[PDB]
Amino acid sequence: ASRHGQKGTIGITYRREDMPFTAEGIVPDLIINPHAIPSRMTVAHLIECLLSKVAALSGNEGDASPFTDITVEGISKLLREHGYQSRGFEVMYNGHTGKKLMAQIFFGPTYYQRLRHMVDDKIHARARGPMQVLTRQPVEGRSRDGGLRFGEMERDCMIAHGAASFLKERLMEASDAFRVHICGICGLMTVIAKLN
Amino acid sequence: SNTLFDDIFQVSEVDPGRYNKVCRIEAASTTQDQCKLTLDINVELFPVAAQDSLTVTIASSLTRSWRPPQAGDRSLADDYDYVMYGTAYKFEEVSKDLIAVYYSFGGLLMRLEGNYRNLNNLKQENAYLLIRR
Amino acid sequence: MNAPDRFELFLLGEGESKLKIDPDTKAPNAVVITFEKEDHTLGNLIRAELLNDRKVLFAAYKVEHPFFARFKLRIQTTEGYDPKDALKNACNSIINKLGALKTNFETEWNLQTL
Amino acid sequence: FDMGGYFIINGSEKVLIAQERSAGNIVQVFKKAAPSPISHVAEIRSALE
Amino acid sequence: TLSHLRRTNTPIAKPRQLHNTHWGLVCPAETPEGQACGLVKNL
Amino acid sequence: YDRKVPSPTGEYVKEPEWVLETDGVNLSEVMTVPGIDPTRIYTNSFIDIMEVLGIEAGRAALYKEVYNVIASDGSYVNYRHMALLVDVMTTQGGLTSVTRHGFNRSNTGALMRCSFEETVEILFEAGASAELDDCRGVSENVILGQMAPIGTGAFDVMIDEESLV
Amino acid sequence: TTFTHCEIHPSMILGVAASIIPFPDHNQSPRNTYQSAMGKQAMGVFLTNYNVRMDTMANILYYPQKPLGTTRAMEYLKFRELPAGQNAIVAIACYSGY
Amino acid sequence: EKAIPKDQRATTPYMTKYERARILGTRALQISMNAPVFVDLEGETDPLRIAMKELAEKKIPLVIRRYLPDGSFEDWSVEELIVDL
Amino acid sequence: RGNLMGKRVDFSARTVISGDPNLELDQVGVPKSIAKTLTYPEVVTPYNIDRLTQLVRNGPNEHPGAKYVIRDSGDRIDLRYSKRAGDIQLQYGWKVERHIMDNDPVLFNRQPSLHKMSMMAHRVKVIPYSTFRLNLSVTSPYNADFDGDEMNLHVPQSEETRAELSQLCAVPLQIVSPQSNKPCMGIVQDTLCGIRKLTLRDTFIELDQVLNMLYWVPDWDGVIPTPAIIKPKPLWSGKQILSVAIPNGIHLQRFDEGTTLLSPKDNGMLIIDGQIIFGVVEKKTVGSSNGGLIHVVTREKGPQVCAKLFGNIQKVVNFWLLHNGFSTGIGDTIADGPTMREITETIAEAKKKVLDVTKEAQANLLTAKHGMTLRESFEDNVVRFLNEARDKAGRLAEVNLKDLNNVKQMVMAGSKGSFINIAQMSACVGQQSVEGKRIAFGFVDRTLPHFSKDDYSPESKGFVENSYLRGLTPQEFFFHAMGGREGLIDTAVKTAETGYIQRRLVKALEDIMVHYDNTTRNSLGNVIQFIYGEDGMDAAHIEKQSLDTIGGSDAAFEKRYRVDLLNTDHTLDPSLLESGSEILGDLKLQVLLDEEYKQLVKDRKFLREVFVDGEANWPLPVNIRRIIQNAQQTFHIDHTKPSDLTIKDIVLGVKDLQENLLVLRGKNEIIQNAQRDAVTLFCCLLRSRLATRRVLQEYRLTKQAFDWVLSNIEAQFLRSVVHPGEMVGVLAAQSIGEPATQMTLNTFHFAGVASKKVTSGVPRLKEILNVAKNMKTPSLTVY
Amino acid sequence: SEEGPQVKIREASKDNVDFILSNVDLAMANSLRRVMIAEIPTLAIDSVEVETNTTVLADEFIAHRLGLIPLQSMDIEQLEYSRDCFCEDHCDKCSVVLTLQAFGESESTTNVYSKDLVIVSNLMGRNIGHPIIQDKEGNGVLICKLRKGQELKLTCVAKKGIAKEHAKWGPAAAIEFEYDPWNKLKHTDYWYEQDSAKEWPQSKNCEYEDPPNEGDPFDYKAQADTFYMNVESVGSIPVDQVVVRGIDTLQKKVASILLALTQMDQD
Amino acid sequence: MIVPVRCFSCGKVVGDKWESYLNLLQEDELDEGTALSRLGLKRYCCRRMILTHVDLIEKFLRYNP
RNA sequence: AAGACCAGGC
Ligand SMILES: [Mg+2]
Ligand SMILES: [Mg+2]
Ligand SMILES: [Zn+2]
Ligand SMILES: [Zn+2]
Ligand SMILES: [Zn+2]
């Protein structure tokens, strides 16, 4: 994420040959999507990333210090004399064709941060395995090669569905499933099954 | 086959309403009294001034897919400056005789008004529109 | 760790041959070719060439999933002119431009000082 | 850079967290609930230091 | 590390709402979402 | 308040009207008043409507008030779903809430009632009032881990008969 | 017209972790709360001496990068001198839909 | 005891989603296990797609027992239930 | 409640979700290492034994593979060890635990699972990368995005557990949903945003691209359609090529505002058989809206034919956008010099408005608004003069937005962004609030230590003069700060509160399922609704159809349904019917059109006393309008040549229909009397769409076509009857509990007046359900 | 100059080729730019065998580091790819081997360069595996640093690969590319507030075309023709060659397609 | 952390310039921008390669063992 | 094993 709470996985990765490219022949280390902007109302991010255009360029200081008198008009005025389109925009070219992009783009340098939670320490999957001793159920946790809780709230939406055969198995042969001997008179588990 | 309508209109309004290539156009026909035309022209192919003498025509051919023209032998029915392709989508009774038709060239609209498109404009999925001069 | 192989972007792993041609059963006389281990570098370029040939009614390529090397060409031409020959000429044409562009460039470069 | 302020308890660093609580020995008045025998209550939490 | 060394805790009127008086003494923005939001504070 | 009313000519007209709105409830006392239409008067307290105008008038008001939470909110649920709630809270007699003081105190299946709240005293007095259990509730059949009498498992399947071709 | 005191600099009301926000006053006010939880979730050099300590989990940035956009509060925070974050070049387009 | 006569049967004469779902499955069970097959398997070699083929032709030999809430019930064969749905 | 009802389970996965715009709707990008672990235990049959002996040899290492091979006298054979994983002499009768593989029944969940649509069958598409991919448009019902959530998948280990997975819960046959008798997946984000772009009147494409898009649609019959423009340079309209995604005989019509079949705004929507005639496509069409394209295409064509439709729309739109671009710059929140100027003087004027009322309240001339304080009426007077001021400023930026404005453009698609955003960001932020009141006096007699005491003015009390692009002041920031947390608080409190509400609902309805006599019951077999939903209908097959006889003058109704053969002036002109001239005069028939026209007053009477507000638009089964166009399109009817049905054909056949529309079948009067009742509404609509004057006059049906209209209806109706079994208990709870989660600002918008406040939202819902004998806002409304 | 696509060199250097590229199709100039980036092969270290690394950097850090170091690829043609060459693992026919030994002798920091890499494998007299030094002083790329008692002993084994493979291999850098500055073909629509002309900056290449002017009805027939580039070498291959081989690699793998039609044609 | 060989964004070798940079700032007293000029970084993704860089290695060496 | 606590993720 950037520094204005713009949480974002990664999704796919293109080599510089497919990526949109400016007329100068630059390439974004990162595409994110205009939809994560106007509902979230993070205007500093559209600032900082403009701001750091004039940082990279003039070798100058990124004074994003809060209650100063630094303005968007300001930044830009500097950028406009500094060689560019004052509001960010740069006519990028599509990668595959090199056909000019009908939109122009706000092209920014913007401190992003790489957070904990990489995909590969949570990619759990089980088909049976270890099993608690008390209740004969899937041990817990992703690092015990556990299994997922198919909690009651999950249950409801199988019943809603009317999926009966499933919800059964997915509660027996996917879990506890056991075999005891019952009394035909009293009905309890007394029966000393001296089997074989 | 074969034409279905012919008349020469005087353009009395060119509204570029918040569009950049396209345009709504208002016209009366030089000859015919109670006749009027409202149409969407692609101004960025064919510039439509005020008061031009646009000659309007509606064919219906000269069926399968499309082929790149192509004038290797091809000669489609045009001494025509400008040619679109439409669908009729509602036919309307504007009192007594005064009938009106509605055409779509993929969203480029066309409203037309008279009373003698009878033996001519039968409810079709055909129609090519042709302008000249 | 569920990352594919890096070179599978140009090595045809056994089985996979480079060109597979199959007959388009939608519209008469037209075919759909599959280029294992290729993309827009190559696709877009052939497709545009097929476009200067007046004998080709229809021509398009599409990268089905960008996970994968593959891309698909669909070619349609006029009765009498086999689809593959279109590829063959638009291919040879590419070469004859490229081949010429190179030597044009060189007599240029070979002028400059610095 | 490591600025201190923790402890080390079996080679595991430990930060004591500020605990927050209402001060003692200040006097305060509280209009008690609408269905109750008492109208207002004055309260002093008293402790020595 | 810097932030955890400047933490706060409050156990059990309107004790999560950022109160007028916090101005300059607690951070107006630092606090964890949900579970114990507004109670845990950073100076 | 705005209100649409049949015209003396056919269609519905906007006829506006003076409506009185209150802070507090005494029903059996303000409908008995002169000047006021005692046939349209309404109160958001569905507990009073229930007591004054009977259960059926209640069931209706409860709905109005449930639906009002939803449709004020921007949403729209289908009448069937809400009404189905509204009817359960009603077919008992008065107003059975959706808490352990409502549905759960009713005499459904011992096993199915226990899975909600107060798991122990529910099972206790069940051993005490020695209750036979249907095992027709979803929950019972879950516990025991057999297929519920639910959608897929509402019927049974058997063979023919005809046999062979 | 009857002052007694004066603030040092308004910026100071902010925490440690919200003082990395570059124009938090141009941002809407939850968000900053969010960043404030993620500043912490970051990777970078957490200590100029990791090659010597021996703890469960470390996570260090191959190339960390003091940002192009700073807050006077960062200096006393030691941020330009120990970042987590890199000045990634950034596109705001719908491209491939991914 | 007890049933309900083959005449005076109220229930939807159609076959419900929930009915067929279980029918197919129960067939798709016997099919997946090597029990014999009642249609010219036209290429199709999958138990469930086969059941769908036997279901379309009505050569599934099974009977729903629909229980009413009073306890008594009505029988319907898969040969005699309309499969519009 | 924790290990019996229910449990931790085997045969599952979790990972981070990721959006895949080249995946199928009902698919499930699954990582290969997962598919390397989970295992459907397959029996061995001569139909499989080849692709199965194959499937052993690959072992648990290569993808399409297998561990353990179960035999008779049940015995495991572990295929990563064992001196025999290479040999292996299979048999019909043995099981083989193959890897999960392409195109498989999985059950793909996401918490919190408050829905039948948080669960679904997806089809399995094995992929690279440790991640689950899914089509963007299965985003809505799951309520994912990819700030990196994380989702589950359970693998059925039986043949009918996978039948029951796919014949029942599969993503498509889930598109249109009981909850709101409308569909719960639409087009979203880029797709939804550029579909608007692509579709503008201004948008044209030329050959090259037109052929790749064409080719990019997978069910495209290889028929390049003729371009709208053939003149200089054959060009296509965006609208045009798009239609190649929309199937055959798909008819749909709208009219938004001032829409004239000449759409001088290019608004509304008219789709005439799988081709679009006018009107910028966006949310209201391809959204998950009510009368929209997916509602139609499903009901109409299939679920499959519709799920296929999902993909196509994207495949094209996405592509078009991949080569159009869309960005959003900070340049997108800059207004005119004039407009910033005038915006600020907007606040200035409304500033000295609040200032003058304050100055009045001070000379003790502020009059006591009846029923409120002196003070409290001042709170009203301001927050009103202050919102008033901010919205006006806000809608003054909205006027000033160019049409090429990235913000304004997503707002127009309806992809992200609404009015307040533009408002905020560019204009003024507005008044802040905690506890419904402006900012607390927190320090004794003022808000922040920086103003004098007793300061009632806006900037003291917590108005934010500024935009976000403007920047905010220190104090302004803090007050924002304060309204901030308040939200974050109750978002934590709401999702917990409503989370318990649902748990109770669900456990309070549970086994209320519809039994095989169409009566809603439970474990004791108590009756709850004698006929489910009051009408025996499933809520998916239902739609907002307009009751033609409620509105309009008696005069206007008259000339609409009246047929008087004995009046020369009110007969069916012999142009309409083929018998027409031979009909004029005639008692024997007039007695039928008479008692038809009486039956239709009994109707207008009966409805006007049910729906007492005139509201003529009610949810109802079997959309008749679609069957009519569908008839007059299938059968190609010319609107000059005379129909060919007797009055006896129509009248006597419409009364014939109504017999066959069975919900209940019992052969005794009691049952047949609720049968008469469950249908009463529907048949109103019937008689109002299928009346003599209408069938003849308006949509000119021929005998042959008519009998088809009559036929579909019967069959469509019968298909709409709720299925015995249906677990309507749970269905009903989650159908109420789910919106409850999505309830914003749990205060109100009644706080413009300082006590027009009425408890609404989640607090109310808590009372209602608890039967709260001491509510916060009791009130009489008196008439 | 002749038949097909024309080239004009505006500026040239060992680092940058500036050129117009006239009378070519769009689809081509691009497919060039693309191969240029990804597909013209080159040598770079692919395998490190570390013996001692008492350094303050991690092993596989420094591995990655030499990964990037630009090795001389002017004779890349006579080296086979390891994957092909019939030699178990590697030989002098398919791989260059390098050696890096350094040690802190100084109390002061002991810097470590690419000038420091020493070859070993038999070069069989060809141009291959000289770490390119564009530096003013004679030591480019600063690999790692050593304190005092610090030691690094390793054995890089450069092999032939391409950008698609890993970017350590692409010889290409930044490639400036542009078609038609005045937006005559209206392939883009300029965002604005006031006046697009005062609001965007006339391209560098504006002097190399005509005015819009002004005036005349948009030209619909006009196609994507003429392109402006300026290709920049990383060092391994000469600038001038990067195009040449780009143009060629394109031609070569279009030819492999043609050829591959001849085979499957058998039956 | 040691100056990167090659800019993440374009690929131009920037690693051989950390040397020549610190020198151009200290001995010639230039400012960051005009020193990035003289070093031949014009595409600013490469200007960002250097100006953002913190050379933490210098501290790690500081540790004796 | 497993209980307790704390951080934390949608
Ligand atoms: Mg979201
Ligand atoms: Mg999310
Ligand atoms: Zn016993
Ligand atoms: Zn070798
Ligand atoms: Zn760079």
Short mmCIF file of C-alpha atoms in Angstrom, two decimals, chain I residues 252-378:
data_model
loop_
_atom_site.label_atom_id
_atom_site.label_comp_id
_atom_site.label_asym_id
_atom_site.label_seq_id
_atom_site.Cartn_x
_atom_site.Cartn_y
_atom_site.Cartn_z
CA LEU I 252 -35.70 -4.33 -23.52
CA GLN I 253 -36.88 -0.72 -23.25
CA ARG I 254 -36.44 2.03 -20.67
CA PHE I 255 -36.82 5.84 -20.91
CA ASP I 256 -34.87 7.62 -18.12
CA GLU I 257 -35.79 11.33 -18.10
CA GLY I 258 -36.73 13.37 -21.20
CA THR I 259 -36.52 10.45 -23.66
CA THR I 260 -38.28 10.68 -26.96
CA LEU I 261 -37.63 7.56 -29.11
CA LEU I 262 -35.33 10.26 -30.49
CA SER I 263 -33.21 10.33 -27.23
CA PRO I 264 -31.76 13.86 -27.59
CA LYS I 265 -29.65 12.97 -24.56
CA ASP I 266 -28.87 9.46 -25.86
CA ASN I 267 -30.36 8.28 -22.56
CA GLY I 268 -32.92 5.61 -21.97
CA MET I 269 -32.26 2.24 -23.50
CA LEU I 270 -33.94 0.34 -26.29
CA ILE I 271 -32.59 -3.07 -27.20
CA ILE I 272 -34.55 -4.66 -30.05
CA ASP I 273 -33.61 -8.29 -30.60
CA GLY I 274 -29.94 -8.66 -29.55
CA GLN I 275 -28.99 -5.27 -31.05
CA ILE I 276 -29.03 -1.82 -29.34
CA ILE I 277 -31.00 0.96 -31.06
CA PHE I 278 -30.13 3.94 -28.80
CA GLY I 279 -28.97 4.89 -25.32
CA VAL I 280 -25.63 4.99 -23.45
CA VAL I 281 -25.22 1.60 -21.70
CA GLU I 282 -24.33 1.82 -17.96
CA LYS I 283 -25.43 0.70 -14.44
CA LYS I 284 -29.23 0.68 -14.89
CA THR I 285 -28.87 -1.74 -17.80
CA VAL I 286 -25.94 -3.95 -17.25
CA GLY I 287 -25.91 -3.28 -13.50
CA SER I 288 -27.42 -5.76 -11.15
CA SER I 289 -30.56 -3.59 -11.42
CA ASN I 290 -34.23 -4.67 -11.59
CA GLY I 291 -35.48 -4.44 -15.18
CA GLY I 292 -31.95 -4.79 -16.50
CA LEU I 293 -30.21 -6.93 -19.10
CA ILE I 294 -29.22 -9.80 -16.81
CA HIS I 295 -32.65 -10.08 -15.28
CA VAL I 296 -34.00 -10.46 -18.82
CA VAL I 297 -31.27 -12.69 -20.40
CA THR I 298 -31.54 -15.12 -17.45
CA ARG I 299 -35.36 -15.45 -17.20
CA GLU I 300 -35.57 -15.31 -20.98
CA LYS I 301 -32.68 -17.35 -22.42
CA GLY I 302 -31.05 -19.59 -19.76
CA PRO I 303 -28.73 -19.31 -16.86
CA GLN I 304 -25.93 -20.67 -19.04
CA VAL I 305 -26.72 -18.51 -22.02
CA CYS I 306 -26.55 -15.65 -19.54
CA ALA I 307 -23.43 -16.71 -17.64
CA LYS I 308 -21.80 -16.94 -21.10
CA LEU I 309 -23.17 -13.46 -21.62
CA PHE I 310 -21.27 -12.27 -18.58
CA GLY I 311 -17.85 -13.11 -20.03
CA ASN I 312 -18.52 -11.78 -23.51
CA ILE I 313 -19.45 -8.32 -22.33
CA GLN I 314 -16.12 -8.04 -20.48
CA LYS I 315 -13.99 -9.78 -23.13
CA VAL I 316 -14.99 -7.08 -25.58
CA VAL I 317 -15.23 -4.09 -23.15
CA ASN I 318 -12.07 -4.96 -21.35
CA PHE I 319 -10.24 -5.23 -24.69
CA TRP I 320 -11.60 -1.95 -25.98
CA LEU I 321 -10.42 -0.32 -22.69
CA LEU I 322 -6.98 -2.10 -22.70
CA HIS I 323 -6.51 0.03 -25.79
CA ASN I 324 -8.43 3.11 -24.57
CA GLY I 325 -7.09 3.90 -21.19
CA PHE I 326 -8.69 5.54 -18.26
CA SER I 327 -6.84 7.39 -15.49
CA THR I 328 -7.86 9.69 -12.67
CA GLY I 329 -5.65 12.77 -12.03
CA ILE I 330 -5.63 15.39 -9.29
CA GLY I 331 -6.31 17.70 -12.20
CA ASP I 332 -9.70 15.95 -11.90
CA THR I 333 -10.59 18.00 -8.75
CA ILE I 334 -9.67 21.58 -9.88
CA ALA I 335 -12.52 24.02 -10.54
CA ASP I 336 -12.86 27.37 -12.38
CA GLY I 337 -11.29 30.53 -11.01
CA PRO I 338 -14.78 31.90 -11.23
CA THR I 339 -16.08 28.68 -9.68
CA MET I 340 -13.72 28.40 -6.68
CA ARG I 341 -14.37 32.17 -6.32
CA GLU I 342 -18.18 31.79 -6.41
CA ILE I 343 -18.01 28.56 -4.30
CA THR I 344 -16.19 30.44 -1.53
CA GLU I 345 -18.58 33.40 -1.66
CA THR I 346 -21.30 30.69 -1.42
CA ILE I 347 -20.06 29.95 2.05
CA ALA I 348 -19.47 33.68 2.83
CA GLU I 349 -23.14 34.60 2.29
CA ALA I 350 -24.42 31.65 4.30
CA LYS I 351 -21.78 32.52 6.87
CA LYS I 352 -23.37 35.95 7.55
CA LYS I 353 -26.69 34.11 7.57
CA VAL I 354 -25.77 32.00 10.61
CA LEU I 355 -24.09 35.11 12.04
CA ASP I 356 -27.33 37.06 11.85
CA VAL I 357 -29.52 34.44 13.48
CA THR I 358 -26.89 34.19 16.26
CA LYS I 359 -27.17 37.95 16.61
CA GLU I 360 -30.96 37.57 16.84
CA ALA I 361 -30.93 34.73 19.40
CA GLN I 362 -28.85 37.24 21.37
CA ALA I 363 -31.41 39.99 21.53
CA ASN I 364 -33.85 37.30 22.65
CA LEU I 365 -36.03 37.60 19.55
CA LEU I 366 -35.51 34.08 18.26
CA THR I 367 -39.04 32.70 18.66
CA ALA I 368 -39.73 29.29 20.20
CA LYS I 369 -40.48 26.87 17.39
CA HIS I 370 -43.45 24.93 18.82
CA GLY I 371 -42.42 21.79 20.68
CA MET I 372 -38.68 22.66 21.01
CA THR I 373 -36.19 24.71 23.15
CA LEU I 374 -35.12 28.22 22.26
CA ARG I 375 -31.57 26.79 21.94
CA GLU I 376 -32.57 23.62 20.14
CA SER I 377 -34.38 25.47 17.38
CA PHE I 378 -31.05 27.35 16.86
#
